[PDB]
């Protein structure tokens, strides 16, 4: 798997690919690894699929209930701290996952969370077996001053690179862009493909 | 005699202590719900105890999720506790099945919790009624639910002090499939019919949901255009 | 004196509190069941509290599974709770054995839950009677069950306010192995005999099952042909 | 005063609430058992509430296993619950030891369950009496057991409304080691002596077991030859 | 007032409810025990309710193990329950230590169970007295025990309706170290003194044990030689 | 009659035992809170029982955390227990989410604990009212909360014996967004209006918090400048 | 051990041998591995003897209780579904057994059940260490159209073959025939021996 | 084992073979691995037979109960999400199974679910030891535009290929077709055989 | 009114139910303890109910261990139960620390068990007083303990019916550090002072312990030399 989350001035971009493998065996080419879990929050999953999917459902339920009770959205840092506690509580019988949580409250944030509850905020992060290849592209090409379009292209590239060298990664790239203005918007497939073509790539 | 414990039947087979719980409901502000063309709405009156109170707080219409809401009448602390049971119950069902196919089941779960407290000694019933209104896979729904745990589905209904006023007015005036705007006007009109003239209706709450959308809470200005 | 706790016998060996629960059953709508040639049917009346109520909702005849159904009378919240116990009990049996060989055993389990609440202090009985009708490996079955946990198997019977009217009419008029259509007509006729003339029978519920089939719920139009 | 809780002694050392449970037993149909040559039998009357009831259902004589049977009188729901305890208790013993050497022990377990409910507050007693009759390794056995948990072994006995009639008749007429046919005739005769003349004995239940065999339930035609 | 709960003291420091339990003991059949030369014996009368009862059944003298026996008076179901506690308690001690060095401790355990039910609300006391007689490593023992949990060791004693008759007779007539035959004669004679003349003593139970032996139950013929 | 257990409704649907808990709250010292420009404040009176008491101890204004504070009135031991529940509840939330986004939720948790004690028999309610005031992510907040578990948000309010005095005075005099100094002066003035002239206001407690700061407890000298 | 169960038109035939071994050590030559557990139901056991015997006792108790409660015999499929649940519930601390349940309700049935609750119906089945040898005789010689006498001979042979090549199998052959007409009838020993002699066999 | 599920315009086709093996030992030639669990839902099982069979029974019970309570059929996605939760809850003492759930609600769906509660929707999927062979046939031959008859043939082929190369797979092929019009219809054996013959295949 | 439950205070702050338990203690036989030169002793009277009782049994002076003994008065069954608690409590302490440094702690544990039964509803107090006398590392100890859980250390004291007689006599006559023989004589003399003349003191129990020794029970002959 390959997932990525980056921050920009007033935006968060999150992307994944869709491949699901039982070992070397590509069982499903269009699994979903990027989910909206609140008005301005998205989550990406890597690791054991059953553990990831359970946690997606809990975070949807709990962030919705929280919002109704508080009449405000959970701060992104709060979402991370919640996940941090949940996962640490069961560290010796853990959720075998790596999560990215990204969103906008008073500012953009991306947090990266491990199966022990370690949570850390960063200007960008990636997870899954393809992540090293992504970290390569980003180290070389990421800029803080990038525009949302530039950023979307960047992530398409990073994941394309990952897909070319990680056999556990493949399929269509999903991208979401989270802004105060328009909220969490999942870019349409035909737009991503267009950019893939315009940038001169494959799959 | 037969009057003084939830676990005691009267010789005519009644549970007076439950009937009494039902009187508590008559002491609340009046609220009503009604179905209209591709949707359902709720309108609630409100005691405004003083001008030192904060308006944008402790709402009579409460969202259970994005597609389901409730109004309540009776003991306010009981009602608060029940609304939060309703919310947690909703989320449990979504986590189990991924969605809330039929609202009747949420309502039944809340109604069962209420029934339970009309059977085991050591507890009193909740002195609360609720109306639940939302959209599910059957369509627009409107239910009520009392301290006994009794449930009914309606086209229109009400709860609170002015219940009987509002239910008559609607028995005479209600038609199905009204457009939203007319349904809201009929509702305000019905609500006024329960007041004691002289007495005038201040800013009430109004929420509405239509098929394929999320709920929508009317702000005080939008509400004003109907007063 | 001997009147006020489920755990107290009277000097004549009676449990009045249970007898009082039985009076709650008399306050329900009348329903009846009867066996006919290769099948069994249920028919139920219904209080229609208002025209603002929703008809296609809270049904007096409730399916327990595809081959077993129940009608109930008395406290509605208690009834609901017992019908869901009935359904979960049915599915436990199917999971254990793969099928429901004898309906009498489902009924007994429901009747035992009810009996239990006539023996331990701290709870009141369920103010409910039920009729269960279905097909099993013995054949078509018809049972009733009351607050005491008492069970009987019938050819025809009834529960609700009009019980006594309906049971007399049937004591005179019932014959075994009627064809379905005549059985339903006898039933509607019996039901009418319990009304107070002037008062007229609106659309009632009708469900029926025959050997080798699943249950079949009559729609309001089909029902109308018998009115 | 001393009358109103199972945990209260009267000043003469009585438990009236238990004595009252014993009055519930008098309201049941009369049944009897008796030992005869290498065997034991049971006979039971039956209220037939209507002609709309189903005869081949809810039997007064109930098998506990292939070699032990019971008849009961009193509150029916309690009796059902006790017979099923009796059955489960029998099977527990067979699983532990491979067989049921002495029926007295089964009966004692049932009697102890009953005694327990005459000592702890929060429960009422079972308003039931039972007769158990079977073959075990001692020989043919006949016991009774009441709401108090009291047990006796008999050559013949009875329970129900007509108990006293039937016991007098048997005090005068019973002899030991009759052949089965004469034993059943004496029983029917005794049963009739408890009716109120004018009133006539419809089809009763008859079960019998002889050493080295399993129980045998008489069908209504076989029973008829004795009426 | 102070009369109606096991947990309530009277102003004079009495527990009437326990005193009342003690009256239950007076309603039983009379039994006695006495020590003689190297041994101890029990004798018990018996209500023979009818000639339809089975004699060789429900014995008033019950073995606890091969070297310890008990007779009881009062509520029969309570007595049964206590004798079985006694037996299980005896076997626990034998498993723990390999033997029952001092019978006083068995009795104390039984007596403590009884006391417990004179202190915690929610239970009534056992309406039973017992006499325990056996051989242990101290020698021949004879104890009694009542509903209060009180214990005494005797040379001779009795329980049941005829207690006071039998104790007086023994206060006058008992000597220590009689041979077995004379001890038994003295016992029968004592027992008779408690009857109401006209009334005559049918076959009673007699058990005895001497140092170095196991218990020995007299059969009805051996018993007859003393009548 | 309907007066004597927390689990009993009156026929008008009231819980008198809770209404009575509410009278306990009238016996406390008067305290008040009010919102002003970018902040909120509390002021409390205090019974000074003697001159042998220690002033710098058992404070009527209690910090829940750095940004939330509470004043309480009624039974003092209950109030202490509730303030510590409030603190522990505040820390649980901070550990779960890293911060306390909305104070209304803390208050609700405390209110729920209180509501719970108005429903289950075996407990009495807390005879306490509280005012919570603090800054959260919505802004400056001011809530009250009573024995029934009822909650309201205010611009200004008060609790204690002088409540009604102080609320009238504020109904006439309060304006929003006063500067801190004027707000405090209005408060002291309001508090004085509740005394019985002759009687004079000794040193009261004053805490305040403004957006972006922590709470700030006025010392007795600073307080004096307002007397 | 060797046990077998076959079905015919209106009959079930079940057979086993009787040997009990602690390893290579023949401790008992006449153990019992065929039991009646209901009017028209029989069970054969293979595997740990203690687990087997406990289950025989439960099935007897529970099928007797069921019959008294329902006033009909447990359907054979129900008997299997019960066992299936019982065994699966304790799969991680299992009954170390293989069971055959055979009987007549509206038709003949034979079910084979494993230590995880796997249950499968078949026209015939065998279990124990001798089973492969039996499955050989049956593959070659079984016919649906066989008569009850033909079937009894068949099973005698299948087990005699198993005994000749499985050292864990031996002793007298037990057979039971279950029919609607006569119920479960355990054939007498002298009749089985007569057929062994007439078919020309040994042990 | 080999099971397969495919989707078409307004139809779902599910098929399995029937072989049950204890290792290399073919114990039963006609086990059942395809079950109807609701009016428009079917399930196929692979893995430990006991665990599979227990889950079939639960799904039948729970989907029947759900329908009576809701007065609608459980959405197919819901059936998957239920199973997903059930299985993940016991992941460290799991049901050793692979499930296919297929059906029609507002559209056709096939979901594939693993022993950790991983659930993924796909246009087609297969499971069991024969699944790679099936995935081969399908990759080459499946079309979205296929008709129900074309689809039935396709699955008969995929499984026939699986049977030819997986010794754990064998026996008669079972097919069910699920449509809004006729619901879950299990094709009759003689019709499957006819198509096997007409396509030129074996077993 | 305030008289009837262990959990109720009278308006003067009394627990009458405990005061009533204290009256149970007056009904016991009189016993006394006193300290003398390097030791402590106990002497107890005894009801001898009959000549059929066994003397060398159920002793009023009971060893708790080799260096500590107790006498009790009041309800005998309660006393037995408390002495065994005492013995088990002693051994727990010895197992934890290897010895019993201070007997005051054993007593407190026993006293606390008693106090506990004067505070939780559902139990009555133990109607017992005890005197504990022994040697520990402080020196010779003498304590008493009553139903309330109250404890005192004495030089001499008594319990039972004759308490007040014996305490006066000792208030006048006791001196510290008597030799053992004179102490015992003073004790016998004191005891006699509580009898009603005519009435004469039969063989009482006498145990004594001196520093560096174990307890020593006087036999009936040794006791006789003081009568």
UniProtKB/Swiss-Prot annotation, chains A, G, H:
GO terms for cellular component: cytoplasm; proteasome core complex, beta-subunit complex. It is an enzyme of class 3 (hydrolase). One of its GO terms (biological process) is proteasomal protein catabolic process. Keywords: Autocatalytic cleavage, Cytoplasm, Hydrolase, Protease, Proteasome, Threonine protease, Zymogen. InterPro entries: Ntn_hydrolases_N, Pept_T1A_Psome_bsu_arc, Pept_T1A_subB, Proteasome_bsu_CS, Proteasome_sua/b, Proteasome_suB-type. It catalyses: Cleavage of peptide bonds with very broad specificity. CDD domains: proteasome_beta_archeal. The keyword Hydrolase applies. NCBIfam families: arc_protsome_B. Belongs to the peptidase T1B family. This is Proteasome subunit beta. The gene is psmB.
Curated annotation (Swiss-Prot), chains B, C, D, E, F, I:
GO terms for cellular component: cytoplasm; proteasome core complex, alpha-subunit complex. It is found in: Cytoplasm. The N-terminus is blocked. Keywords: Cytoplasm, Proteasome. The keyword Cytoplasm applies. Pfam families: Proteasome (PF00227), Proteasome_A_N (PF10584). Its main location: cytoplasm. Changing residue 76 to D/G: Prevents PAN to stimulate gate opening. Component of the proteasome core, a large protease complex with broad specificity involved in protein degradation. The T.acidophilum proteasome is able to cleave oligopeptides after Tyr, Leu, Phe, and to a lesser extent after Glu and Arg. Thus, displays chymotrypsin-like activity and low level of caspase-like and trypsin-like activities. The 20S proteasome core is composed of 14 alpha and 14 beta subunits that assemble into four stacked heptameric rings, resulting in a barrel-shaped structure. The two inner rings, each composed of seven catalytic beta subunits, are sandwiched by two outer rings, each composed of seven alpha subunits. The catalytic chamber with the active sites is on the inside of the barrel. Has a gated structure, the ends of the cylinder being occluded by the N-termini of the alpha-subunits. Is capped at one or both ends by the proteasome regulatory ATPase, PAN. Belongs to the peptidase T1A family. The configuration of the closed gate contains an opening large enough to allow rapid entry of tetrapeptides but able to impede the entry of proteins and longer peptides. This is Proteasome subunit alpha. It comes from Thermoplasma acidophilum (strain ATCC 25905 / DSM 1728 / JCM 9062 / NBRC 15155 / AMRC-C165).
């Amino acid at each position: 798997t390959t997932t990525v989350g980056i921050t920009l001035k007033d935006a968060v971009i999150m992307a994944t690919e869709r491949r699901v493998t039982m070992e070397n065996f590509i069982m499903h080419k269009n699994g979903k690894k990027l989910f909206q879990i609140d008005t301005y929050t998205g989550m990406t999953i890597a690791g054991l699929v059953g553990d990831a999917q359970v946690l997606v459902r809990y975070m949807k339920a709990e962030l919705e209930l929280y919002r109704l009770q508080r009449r405000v959205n959970m701060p992104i840092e709060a979402v991370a701290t919640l996940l941090s506690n949940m996962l640490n509580q069961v560290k010796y019988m853990p959720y075998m996952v790596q999560l990215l949580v990204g969103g906008i409250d008073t500012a953009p944030h991306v947090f990266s969370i491990d199966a022990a509850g370690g949570s850390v905020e960063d200007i960008y992060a990636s997870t899954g077996s393809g992540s090293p290849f992504v970290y390569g592209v980003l180290e070389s090409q990421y800029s803080e001053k990038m525009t949302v379009d530039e950023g979307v292209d960047l992530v398409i590239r990073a994941i394309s690179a990952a897909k070319q060298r990680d056999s556990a990664s493949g399929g269509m790239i999903d991208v979401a862009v989270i802004t105060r203005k328009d909220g969490y918007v999942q870019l349409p497939t035909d737009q991503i493909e267009s950019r893939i073509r315009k940038l001169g790539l494959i799959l | 005699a037969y009057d003084r414990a939830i676990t005691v039947f009267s010789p005519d087979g009644r549970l007076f202590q439950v009937e009494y719980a039902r009187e508590a409901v008559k002491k609340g502000s009046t609220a009503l719900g009604m179905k209209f063309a591709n949707g359902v709405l709720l309108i609630s009156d409100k005691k405004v105890r003083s001008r030192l109170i904060e308006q944008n707080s402790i709402e009579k219409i409460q969202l259970i999720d994005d597609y389901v809401a409730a109004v309540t009448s009776g003991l306010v602390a009981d009602a608060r506790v029940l609304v939060d049971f309703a919310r947690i119950s909703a989320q449990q069902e979504k986590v189990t099945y991924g969605s809330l196919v039929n609202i009747e089941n949420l309502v039944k779960r809340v109604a069962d919790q209420m029934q339970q407290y009309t059977q085991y000694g050591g507890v009193r019933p909740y002195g609360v009624s609720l109306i639940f209104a939302g959209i599910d896979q059957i369509g627009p729904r409107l239910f009520d639910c009392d301290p006994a745990g009794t449930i009914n589905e309606y086209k229109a209904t009400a709860i609170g002090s002015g219940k009987d006023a509002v239910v008559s007015f609607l028995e005479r005036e209600y038609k199905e499939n009204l457009p939203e705007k007319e349904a809201v006007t009929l509702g305000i009109k019905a609500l006024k019919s329960s007041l004691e003239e002289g007495e005038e209706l201040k800013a009430p709450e109004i929420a509405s949901i239509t098929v394929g959308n999320k709920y929508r809470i009317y702000d005080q200005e939008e509400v004003k255009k109907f007063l």
